[PDB]
From TrEMBL:
GO terms for biological process: cellular response to phosphate starvation; phosphate ion transport; regulation of DNA-templated transcription. Member of the two-component regulatory system PhoR/PhoB involved in the phosphate regulon genes expression. PhoR may function as a membrane-associated protein kinase that phosphorylates PhoB in response to environmental signals. The keyword S-adenosyl-L-methionine does not apply. Coiled coil: none annotated. The chain holds residues 277 to 432 of 433 of the full protein. Keywords: ATP-binding, Cell inner membrane, Cell membrane, Kinase, Membrane, Nucleotide-binding, Phosphate transport, Phosphoprotein, Transferase, Transmembrane, Transmembrane helix, Transport, Two-component regulatory system. One of its GO terms (cellular component) is plasma membrane. One of its GO terms (molecular function) is phosphorelay sensor kinase activity. It comes from Vibrio cholerae. It is found in: Cell inner membrane. This is Phosphate regulon sensor protein PhoR. The lineage of its organism: Bacteria, Pseudomonadati, Pseudomonadota, Gammaproteobacteria, Vibrionales. The gene is phoR. It comes from the Bacteria.
Length: 124
């Protein structure tokens, strides 16, 4: 509450951090970001939640693996997804924004880390 977090700007910085972290592993990082979507949130907690999801996917996918990061509007609020083909800080950061970390796996196909922030936190 009480502060608008520019997630698009956050995600642009996080992209460079993720390519830097990947280094010569040359992960194919892909960011689909609604640049108009900002949220009312605690910047420190939200940066930590999103950053740790992206770093984790870089560390647990083989070199050259494809990683999709998405930031978009649902009907129910703002959705962050990290999908491929140190979660305590994520869980608690999200809990302070009244949301849960969701994890979906299709075994043998890939996994998706995602969360939806409540719609009262969408900024206009």
């Amino acid at each position: 509450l009480d502060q608008v977090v520019d997630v698009p700007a956050m995600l642009e910085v996080l992209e460079k951090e993720a390519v830097s972290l990947s280094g010569e592993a040359q992960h194919k990082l892909h960011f689909e970001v609604d640049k108009s979507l900002k949220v009312l949130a605690d910047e420190d907690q939200l940066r930590s939640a999103i950053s740790n999801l992206v770093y984790n996917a870089v560390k647990y996918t083989p070199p050259g693996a494809q990683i999709d990061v998405r930031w978009y509007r649902t009907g129910k609020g703002a959705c962050l997804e990290v999908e491929d083909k140190g979660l305590a800080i994520v869980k608690h950061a999200l809990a302070h924004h009244d949301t849960h970390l969701d994890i979906y796996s299709k075994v043998g196909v890939g996994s998706k880390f995602s969360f939806v922030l409540p719609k009262r936190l969408v900024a206009k």
